[PDB]
Write an enzyme that holds these catalytic residues in place. Structure first.
Site, PDB file in Angstrom:
ATOM      1  N   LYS A  82      -9.920   1.091  -3.278  1.00  6.24           N
ATOM      2  CA  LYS A  82      -9.470  -0.117  -1.672  1.00  6.24           C
ATOM      3  C   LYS A  82     -10.993   0.469  -1.344  1.00  6.24           C
ATOM      4  O   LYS A  82     -11.063   0.985  -1.191  1.00  6.24           O
ATOM      5  CB  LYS A  82      -8.640  -0.426  -2.078  1.00  6.24           C
ATOM      6  CG  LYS A  82      -7.293   0.001  -3.071  1.00  6.24           C
ATOM      7  CD  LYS A  82      -6.200  -0.922  -1.836  1.00  6.24           C
ATOM      8  CE  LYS A  82      -5.015   0.706  -1.202  1.00  6.24           C
ATOM      9  NZ  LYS A  82      -3.902   0.204  -1.029  1.00  6.24           N
ATOM     10  N   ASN A  86      -2.659   0.177   6.841  1.00  7.08           N
ATOM     11  CA  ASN A  86      -4.076   1.040   7.492  1.00  7.08           C
ATOM     12  C   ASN A  86      -5.212  -0.547   7.303  1.00  7.08           C
ATOM     13  O   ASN A  86      -4.969  -1.146   6.610  1.00  7.08           O
ATOM     14  CB  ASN A  86      -4.514   1.996   5.979  1.00  7.08           C
ATOM     15  CG  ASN A  86      -4.467   3.119   5.373  1.00  7.08           C
ATOM     16  OD1 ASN A  86      -4.182   3.726   5.924  1.00  7.08           O
ATOM     17  ND2 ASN A  86      -3.118   3.247   4.319  1.00  7.08           N
ATOM     18  N   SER A 120       0.365  -3.452   4.655  1.00 11.64           N
ATOM     19  CA  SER A 120      -0.429  -2.295   4.800  1.00 11.64           C
ATOM     20  C   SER A 120      -0.582  -1.275   6.165  1.00 11.64           C
ATOM     21  O   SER A 120      -0.411  -2.460   7.260  1.00 11.64           O
ATOM     22  CB  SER A 120      -1.882  -2.271   4.448  1.00 11.64           C
ATOM     23  OG  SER A 120      -2.980  -1.098   4.431  1.00 11.64           O
ATOM     24  N   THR A 132       1.672   3.988   4.016  1.00 11.70           N
ATOM     25  CA  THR A 132       2.400   2.750   4.779  1.00 11.70           C
ATOM     26  C   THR A 132       3.851   2.697   4.141  1.00 11.70           C
ATOM     27  O   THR A 132       4.970   2.365   4.597  1.00 11.70           O
ATOM     28  CB  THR A 132       1.635   1.445   3.632  1.00 11.70           C
ATOM     29  OG1 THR A 132       0.644   1.651   4.323  1.00 11.70           O
ATOM     30  CG2 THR A 132       3.013   0.102   3.887  1.00 11.70           C
ATOM     31  N   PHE A 182      -8.433  -0.856   6.865  1.00 10.24           N
ATOM     32  CA  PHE A 182      -9.431  -1.540   6.094  1.00 10.24           C
ATOM     33  C   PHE A 182      -8.578  -1.918   5.165  1.00 10.24           C
ATOM     34  O   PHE A 182      -8.986  -2.778   3.936  1.00 10.24           O
ATOM     35  CB  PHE A 182     -10.428  -0.143   5.354  1.00 10.24           C
ATOM     36  CG  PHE A 182      -9.168   1.060   4.214  1.00 10.24           C
ATOM     37  CD1 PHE A 182      -8.562   1.798   4.558  1.00 10.24           C
ATOM     38  CD2 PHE A 182      -9.658   0.758   3.250  1.00 10.24           C
ATOM     39  CE1 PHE A 182      -7.392   2.897   4.289  1.00 10.24           C
ATOM     40  CE2 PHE A 182      -8.347   1.479   2.506  1.00 10.24           C
ATOM     41  CZ  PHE A 182      -8.011   2.658   2.958  1.00 10.24           C
ATOM     42  N   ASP A 183      -7.334  -1.814   4.966  1.00  7.50           N
ATOM     43  CA  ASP A 183      -6.928  -2.449   3.064  1.00  7.50           C
ATOM     44  C   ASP A 183      -6.508  -4.016   3.608  1.00  7.50           C
ATOM     45  O   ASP A 183      -6.228  -4.585   3.263  1.00  7.50           O
ATOM     46  CB  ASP A 183      -5.475  -0.856   3.242  1.00  7.50           C
ATOM     47  CG  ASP A 183      -4.910  -1.676   1.352  1.00  7.50           C
ATOM     48  OD1 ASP A 183      -5.092  -2.024   1.012  1.00  7.50           O
ATOM     49  OD2 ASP A 183      -3.606  -0.944   2.291  1.00  7.50           O
ATOM     50  N   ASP A 227       0.574  -1.207   0.005  1.00  7.13           N
ATOM     51  CA  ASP A 227      -0.209  -0.069   0.359  1.00  7.13           C
ATOM     52  C   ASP A 227       0.853   1.433   0.198  1.00  7.13           C
ATOM     53  O   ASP A 227       1.978   1.109   0.278  1.00  7.13           O
ATOM     54  CB  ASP A 227      -0.636  -0.165   1.508  1.00  7.13           C
ATOM     55  CG  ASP A 227      -1.470   1.103   1.340  1.00  7.13           C
ATOM     56  OD1 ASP A 227      -2.366   1.909   0.764  1.00  7.13           O
ATOM     57  OD2 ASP A 227      -1.689   1.860   2.786  1.00  7.13           O
ATOM     58  N   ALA A 228       0.495   2.417  -0.600  1.00 11.33           N
ATOM     59  CA  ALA A 228       1.049   3.992  -0.676  1.00 11.33           C
ATOM     60  C   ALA A 228       1.229   4.698   0.660  1.00 11.33           C
ATOM     61  O   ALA A 228       2.106   4.740   1.508  1.00 11.33           O
ATOM     62  CB  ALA A 228       1.049   3.897  -2.112  1.00 11.33           C
ATOM     63  N   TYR A 229       0.025   5.241   0.352  1.00  9.42           N
ATOM     64  CA  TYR A 229      -0.060   5.759   1.557  1.00  9.42           C
ATOM     65  C   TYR A 229      -0.611   6.099   2.760  1.00  9.42           C
ATOM     66  O   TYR A 229      -1.557   4.999   3.486  1.00  9.42           O
ATOM     67  CB  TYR A 229      -0.940   7.196   1.060  1.00  9.42           C
ATOM     68  CG  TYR A 229      -1.398   7.682  -0.352  1.00  9.42           C
ATOM     69  CD1 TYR A 229      -0.652   8.168  -0.231  1.00  9.42           C
ATOM     70  CD2 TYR A 229      -1.945   7.245  -1.332  1.00  9.42           C
ATOM     71  CE1 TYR A 229      -0.239   8.820  -2.165  1.00  9.42           C
ATOM     72  CE2 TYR A 229      -2.674   7.783  -2.411  1.00  9.42           C
ATOM     73  CZ  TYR A 229      -0.909   8.914  -2.991  1.00  9.42           C
ATOM     74  OH  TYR A 229      -0.687   9.091  -4.677  1.00  9.42           O
ATOM     75  N   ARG A 252      -6.959  14.190   4.854  1.00 10.52           N
ATOM     76  CA  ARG A 252      -6.339  12.284   4.899  1.00 10.52           C
ATOM     77  C   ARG A 252      -7.709  11.715   5.135  1.00 10.52           C
ATOM     78  O   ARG A 252      -8.028  10.529   4.004  1.00 10.52           O
ATOM     79  CB  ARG A 252      -6.012  12.157   5.604  1.00 10.52           C
ATOM     80  CG  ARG A 252      -5.370  10.179   6.222  1.00 10.52           C
ATOM     81  CD  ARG A 252      -5.145   9.717   4.101  1.00 10.52           C
ATOM     82  NE  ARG A 252      -4.611   8.758   5.035  1.00 10.52           N
ATOM     83  CZ  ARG A 252      -4.532   8.186   3.996  1.00 10.52           C
ATOM     84  NH1 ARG A 252      -4.868   7.910   2.205  1.00 10.52           N
ATOM     85  NH2 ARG A 252      -4.207   6.213   4.057  1.00 10.52           N
ATOM     86  N   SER A 301      -1.871   1.103  -5.511  1.00 10.02           N
ATOM     87  CA  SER A 301      -2.330   2.292  -4.589  1.00 10.02           C
ATOM     88  C   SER A 301      -3.639   2.868  -4.620  1.00 10.02           C
ATOM     89  O   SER A 301      -3.941   2.746  -6.375  1.00 10.02           O
ATOM     90  CB  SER A 301      -1.161   3.318  -4.387  1.00 10.02           C
ATOM     91  OG  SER A 301      -1.747   3.859  -3.903  1.00 10.02           O
ATOM     92  N   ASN A 302      -4.812   3.728  -4.000  1.00  9.68           N
ATOM     93  CA  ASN A 302      -5.493   4.303  -5.187  1.00  9.68           C
ATOM     94  C   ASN A 302      -5.062   5.569  -5.916  1.00  9.68           C
ATOM     95  O   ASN A 302      -5.553   6.203  -6.473  1.00  9.68           O
ATOM     96  CB  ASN A 302      -6.241   4.863  -3.969  1.00  9.68           C
ATOM     97  CG  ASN A 302      -6.975   4.028  -2.606  1.00  9.68           C
ATOM     98  OD1 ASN A 302      -7.564   2.713  -3.500  1.00  9.68           O
ATOM     99  ND2 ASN A 302      -7.825   4.283  -1.503  1.00  9.68           N
TER     100      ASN A 302
END
Lengths: 245, 245
Positions: free
Chosen positions: A147, A173, A171, A12, A175-176, A8-10, A39, A114-115
């Protein structure tokens, strides 16, 4: 066996708090507030646009969320201003031990799911000096969902050729983590905030703004399947993968 | 012509803050915190479960959200404790002017379209003595999605035999306003928090926990289509419909 580590990017690989210096500009004294709500709404809008069947890419989502956030403060900035400020999301500082981690994972395939819209992701990775660390940087944009929609995770096999069973998804996150698990990946959650620290912070007297958002965003989500592994940092991943399979 | 007025339930007809006393017992000194995070996570979990394609009814969602919320404080309540306390959501107090509003709206068709599971809704409506104020109390459960998924709004014509064009949808929730507009209803938003007050509250110095949640939940969402109408209270709807037609 694990053939690929997909990140995951944002939040992570990249610190979404690093927009702080820039947000502190749109409203001196309110940089922290803006950072948190921006965010939170970025996430909510990605989920809500997808669930309505009204996709727009993460660049549009990011600017809509910024517009909302600044609007709560009574501001009404124009599109030009929003586009300029939103660029902060394409310059997030990677986490300190991100580089070393990806390096020690060089044998395996390394990717990002990533989103983030295609152009956002390229800038983000390039600016972080991590372009040469990934065999693929995958955006959900092609599927026109966000996602944790299953079609997002389906891209990993479509791009890398590996099956869910051969992927370790990473991740920070909740939820991810939940979406990746539901889809069938093995998951390593990066938990930078100890539960016991949050609990005490939440009773350390008056609850500060920032504590609220940690409380909303930095825990495992109760509806979600638990991650296979939880590490405190990206740097612990290589050693996790070694004595893993 | 408007033939039916369809109401969102939680937050619109019913006060989600009225769980205040039950939450304060769950953790004295932290009732406000729990109330806010519980509601926030209840919404998030409804969205995320639906978007993952892993539906569970609103009763499970409500219990999971509560478990998460109490967990942030360091508690580990058993299922029996959760089922018991979550009952508070089936006892929400209706807003003081809902009864009058509903009365003046007859003989127009009047209904509820809500995330609530069927049993939650009938117990909620019964406890408030509003059973005879509705032609239908519609749960999304049959569709196994949550708002703002278009299928949830599709239930209105299925149950009432009125077209989207003949429906005035009423909600205090920005995402629900957005979902109903996306689907094709005319929408009246109930806006109980003046923007100008929020803006000043967020600048009044230290941002109290409660201000964060208002900031997150009481505005129109930037990605959403604007409501057709905005009123300050439910009592204004009968007037709206007249001056409307």
């Amino acid at each position: 066996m694990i053939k690929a580590v997909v990140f995951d990017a944002y939040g992570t690989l990249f610190d979404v708090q690093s927009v702080a210096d820039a947000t502190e500009r749109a409203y001196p004294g309110r940089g922290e507030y803006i950072t948190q709500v921006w965010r939170q709404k970025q996430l909510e809008y990605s989920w809500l646009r997808a669930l309505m069947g009204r996709y727009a890419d993460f660049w549009s989502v990011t600017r809509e969320a910024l517009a909302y956030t600044l609007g709560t403060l009574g501001l009404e900035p124009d599109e030009s201003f929003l586009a300029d400020m939103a660029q902060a999301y394409n310059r997030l500082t990677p986490y300190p031990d991100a580089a070393q981690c990806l390096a020690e994972l060089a044998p395996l395939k390394r990717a990002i799911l990533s989103n983030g819209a295609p152009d956002m992701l390229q800038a983000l990775v390039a600016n972080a000096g991590l372009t040469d660390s990934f065999d693929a940087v995958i955006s959900v944009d092609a599927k026109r969902v966000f996602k944790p929609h299953p079609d997002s995770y389906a891209l990993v096999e479509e791009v890398l050729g590996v099956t869910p069973a051969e992927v370790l998804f990473v991740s920070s996150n909740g939820f991810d983590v939940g979406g990746a698990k539901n889809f069938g990946f093995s998951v390593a959650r990066v938990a930078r905030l100890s539960q016991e620290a949050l609990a005490r912070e939440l009773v350390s007297g008056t609850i500060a703004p920032l504590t609220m958002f940690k409380a909303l965003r930095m825990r495992e989500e109760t509806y979600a399947e638990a991650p296979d592994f939880v590490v405190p940092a990206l740097g612990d991943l290589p050693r996790l993968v070694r004595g893993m399979a």
